[PDB]
Design a protein around this nucleic acid. Structure first.
Ligand SMILES: Nc1nc2c(ncn2[C@H]2C[C@H](O)[C@@H](COP(=O)(O)OP(=O)(O)OP(=O)(O)O)O2)c(=O)[nH]1
Ligand SMILES: [Ca+2]
Ligand SMILES: [Ca+2]
Ligand SMILES: [Ca+2]
Ligand SMILES: [Ca+2]
Ligand SMILES: [Ca+2]
Ligand SMILES: [Ca+2]
Ligand SMILES: [Ca+2]
Length: 901
DNA sequence: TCACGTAAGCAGTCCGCG
DNA sequence: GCGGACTGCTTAC
């Protein structure tokens, strides 16, 4: 096999590299890498190196990396550009791996670990590490084993050994229900004392040194705690054995509000699963506890125990250890579904970066572009200082708030990357500028044609047409990868709907799920067999189809994220290729494209309907248009359709055969107008929406920009077994909205769109009558909690104190004195409840850490003083009033002449 | 919330609005 | 009471 790196570090004048050799073995080497950098030279001098603008450069080879860094400094002192890759480990990887990397994940040691620390006096601070580490579970991907290190003797209690037999038993047997599939994979090691435990862990770590290190909050808790605890017991040198090169650095992580400290282990790539989840999952959660996320992702029950966690080891050590083991497994289960480790490895090896750099698209793109240019003997420019400047973004149409019965939407494929490719936008393709007219003039095609030579954006920029820029070239590669995975995702989605259909008529038989590849549309033969399957087999196939869809979604949406982040990176001052001319060229072109096609669609439809000035496009945001299809349906007549599917088919055919060709012609004209390099504005039908045939449902409504709901029957070629609510921006979609309220508002919307006013009124009446029975957590609002200290004036709210911060200050006074009570963490999320006038907390609201039950010291009083009326008005009635008034209907029955008889 | 971008909605504070 | 200036937080794209 071809070799591939695992980790790379610069330490002084050496590169330290862990890699897999040509025989599949893990090796380590120290290399005295001599980097090269570049300077401009006279034209009359013979060279093969040129900068991206075509100016000749001389290569300077340095005795060592420090000499290269000091040369960069002197060049600044002189006032001359120092060209080339200044991150020497990226240059090393580029030199050492000058081919497309084919990696074997089975040779990469991926470690997933979790620790337990008993602490009576509050949260055990990693920087202090003053309490014993009393449990470690460490899963190794190569061994496929859970290594359990269990402390039996502590100043906080002496305990008996954990029993794997009781661990395996049902909770109804007094057991812990550790999943049977991992029982045989547990390697249990009890310890007489903490020093023994930690020494053995370090020996273990040395034998099985993680390459990728993950877990849940490992970077903020587990790693710095273990490091600092070993440091406290044994000294720094022993703690540094956590690094395969015995080098660590305290790293200060700074944000807008403050700073925290992590430990950097040289020679290890830490990918904390919480951070992977936050970047790559496209969720915003009310809580990021492992229990909360595990329930959301896997539908597993909350890990139940009695009393505080600080007393769990002493009261029930058996459960204590089992739950530590289960916590490690939960992360593995989440990754088996979401596949973020696979994604990170794919992206990291593609770009030739340290794997942990996948969090940074700026770093990722710097490496991709550097490697690409190096292939042509081209030389990258020096990164420069830039002041942060605002620049314009997308266009969003102001909709007329209303119900909209029949709606068909259309959307541009991968817009910003398609603009980059169409226009040929890149640092080195800038050809000059032209005199700009108002955007309106380009939109309406009355402005003078910008150029007869170059490819243009309506921000005034011109680009070369003779050759693709490096940015278009490299963005195209990742776009094409994304396209493949999106195809797999959509096929799995369509396949899932087939199974859902068949589930309406399951067979009474014993059988097995079919062995199929869900990434490809089911054949006729598979379809025939599916129709003969039991509900058990069908449900298993559905689960598998949905897992395939999720895997496809991870792969496609995050490649979309990477390419969109290149468009954004052009507007970030730390990007080597930062250029507001280019960032704005993209966004302004987008504004034109959307409003151009709005005009074209309105013109086309006014023509076919024989009208004038009628607004068929009701809304658009960035790259999408929403078209009123009422007049199209009315042209054949609702009574002419056999069922809902019949008019959906009709609108599908109309979009495909009439509208898409009209849209295409309109965009080809725009391409010619801007003289672009390549026509890539591909706008396809997205959603077909409307009420069920024969119903009183309203189909859809808009309340304003970025706030709408549609009853969708078909989305991007997926014909749903049951209609799907597409709700954007409304309170149902916000993590700040109480869980039970999201649910109730969603049902109000469902009834509005599918059933009509009377159904809505019936439901509202019931919710208002019963909502006081709902669990307090389900009706609590949620908010991030920043700058608590800023608004804290002697325990009370200062001027302009936000409502949720007021709640936290209330909480802090009510728990004051208690070291044991859960503390609200700065920057984390809280639940928030309003309190009735005259309550013992002395304020109008209270907040506590999200994902948790409020402490038993104040729970009874919170429940008693909860202001249900205010809660209902703010979270439910106010938003529903917004929905219904927009839709022109009433959530409460109006008085009529029929009342009373 | 260390880690690409802008547009834009709503909650809530403060205070005006005769 | 609403709304404007503002902070804060959260979505859509
Ligand atoms: N910089 C940046 N721009 C974004 C992001 N999300 C959306 N945009 C901009 C660029 C997109 O091309 C454009 C339209 O977004 P869409 O959600 O419709 O996705 P896009 O067209 O890229 O992909 P698609 O092929 O429709 O699935 O909006 C983002 O996360 N970062
Ligand atoms: Ca724990
Ligand atoms: Ca799009
Ligand atoms: Ca599409
Ligand atoms: Ca059947
Ligand atoms: Ca879109
Ligand atoms: Ca098309
Ligand atoms: Ca203070």
């Amino acid at each position: 096999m071809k070799e591939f790196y695992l980790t790379v570090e610069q330490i002084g004048d050496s590169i330290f590299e862990r890699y897999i050799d040509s025989n599949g073995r893990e090796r380590t080497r120290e290399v005295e890498y001599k980097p090269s950098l570049f300077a401009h030279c006279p034209e009359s001098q013979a060279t093969k190196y040129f900068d991206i603008y075509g100016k000749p450069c001389t290569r300077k080879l340095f005795a060592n990396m420090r000499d290269a860094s000091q040369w960069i400094k002197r060049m600044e002192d002189i006032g001359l550009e120092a060209l080339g890759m200044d991150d020497f480990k990226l240059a090393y990887l580029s030199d050492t791996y000058n081919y497309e990397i084919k990696y074997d994940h089975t040779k990469i040691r991926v470690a997933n670990f979790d620790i337990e620390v008993t602490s009576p006096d509050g949260f055990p601070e990693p920087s202090q590490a003053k309490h014993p580490i009393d449990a470690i579970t460490h899963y190794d991907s190569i061994d496929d084993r859970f290594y359990v290190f269990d402390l039996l003797n502590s100043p906080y209690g002496n305990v008996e050994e954990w029993s794997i037999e009781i661990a395996a038993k049902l909770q109804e047997q007094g057991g812990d229900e550790v999943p049977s599939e991992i029982i045989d994979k547990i390697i249990y090691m009890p310890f007489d004392n903490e020093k023994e435990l930690l020494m053995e862990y370090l020996n273990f770590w040395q034998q099985k040194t993680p390459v990728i290190l993950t877990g849940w909050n490992v970077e903020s808790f587990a790693i710095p705690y273990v490091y600092n605890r070993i440091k406290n017991i044994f000294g720094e040198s022993t703690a540094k054995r956590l690094s395969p090169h015995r080098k660590t650095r305290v790293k200060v992580i700074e944000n807008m509000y403050g700073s925290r400290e992590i430990i950097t282990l040289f020679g290890i790539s830490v990918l904390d699963y919480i951070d992977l989840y936050k970047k790559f999952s496209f969720t915003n959660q009310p809580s990021y506890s492992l229990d909360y996320i595990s329930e959301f992702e896997l539908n597993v029950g909350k890990l139940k125990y009695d009393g505080p966690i600080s007393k769990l080891r002493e009261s029930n050590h058996q459960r204590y250890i089992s739950y530590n083991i289960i916590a490690v497994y939960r992360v593995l289960q989440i990754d088996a579904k979401r596949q973020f480790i696979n994604l990170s490895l794919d992206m990291g090896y593609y770009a030739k970066i340290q794997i942990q750099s996948v969090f940074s698209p700026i770093k990722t793109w710097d490496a991709i572009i550097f490697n690409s240019l190096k292939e042509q003997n081209k030389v990258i420019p020096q990164g420069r200082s830039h002041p942060v400047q605002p620049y314009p973004g997308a266009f969003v149409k102001e909709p007329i708030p209303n119900r909209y019965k029949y709606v068909m939407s259309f959307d541009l494929t991968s817009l910003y990357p398609s603009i980059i490719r169409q226009v040929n936008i890149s640092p080195e393709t800038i050809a000059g500028t032209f005199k700009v007219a108002p955007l309106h003039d380009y939109i309406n095609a009355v402005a003078e044609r910008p150029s007869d030579v170059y490819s243009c954006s309506p921000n005034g920029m011109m680009y070369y047409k003779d050759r693709d820029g490096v940015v278009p070239t490299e963005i195209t590669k990742v776009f094409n990868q994304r396209k493949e995975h999106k195809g797999y995702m959509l096929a799995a989605q369509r396949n899932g709907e087939i199974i859902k259909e068949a589930l309406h008529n399951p067979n009474l038989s014993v059988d097995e799920p079919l062995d199929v590849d869900y990434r490809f549309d089911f054949s006729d033969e598979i379809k025939e067999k599916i129709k003969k399957l039991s509900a058990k087999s069908l449900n298993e196939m559905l689960f598998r189809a949905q897992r395939t869809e999720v895997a496809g979604m991870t792969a496609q949406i995050n490649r979309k994220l990477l390419i969109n982040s290149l468009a954004g990176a052009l507007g970030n001052v730390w990007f080597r290729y930062y250029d507001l001319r280019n960032a704005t060229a993209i966004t302004t072109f987008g504004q034109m494209a959307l409003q151009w096609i709005e005009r074209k669609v309105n013109e086309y439809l006014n023509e076919v309907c024989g009208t004038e000035g009628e607004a068929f496009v009701l809304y658009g945001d960035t790259d999408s248009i929403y078209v009123s299809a009422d007049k199209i349906i009315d042209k054949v007549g609702e009574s002419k359709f056999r069922d809902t599917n019949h008019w959906v088919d009709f609108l599908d055919k109309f979009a495909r055969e009439r509208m898409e060709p009209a849209i295409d012609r309109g965009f080809r004209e725009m391409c010619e107008y801007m003289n672009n390099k390549q026509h890539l504005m591909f706008m396809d039908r997205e959603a077909i929406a409307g009420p069920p045939l024969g119903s009183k449902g309203i189909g859809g409504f808009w309340t304003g920009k970025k706030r709408y709901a549609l009853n969708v029957w078909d989305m991007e070629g997926t014909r749903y077994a049951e209609p799907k609510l597409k709700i954007m921006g409304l309170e149902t979609q916000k993590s700040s909205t109480p869980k039970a309220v999201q649910k109730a508002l969603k049902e109000c919307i469902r009834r509005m769109l599918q059933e009509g006013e009377e159904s809505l009124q019936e439901y509202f009446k019931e919710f208002e009558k019963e909502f006081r029975q709902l669990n307090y957590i389900s009706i609590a609002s949620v908010s991030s909690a920043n700058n608590i200290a800023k608004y804290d004036v002697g325990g009370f709210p200062g001027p302009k104190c936000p409502f949720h911060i007021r709640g936290i200050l209330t909480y802090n006074r009510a728990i004051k004195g208690n070291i044991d009570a859960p503390q609200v963490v700065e920057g984390e999320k809280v639940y928030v409840l309003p309190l009735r006038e005259g309550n013992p907390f002395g304020d109008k609201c209270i907040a506590w850490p999200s994902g948790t039950e409020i402490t038993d010291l104040i729970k009874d009083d919170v429940l008693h003083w909860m202001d249900y009326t205010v809660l209902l008005e703010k979270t439910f009635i106010k938003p529903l009033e917004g929905f219904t008034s927009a839709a022109k209907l009433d959530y409460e029955k109006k008085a009529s002449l029929f009342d009373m008889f």
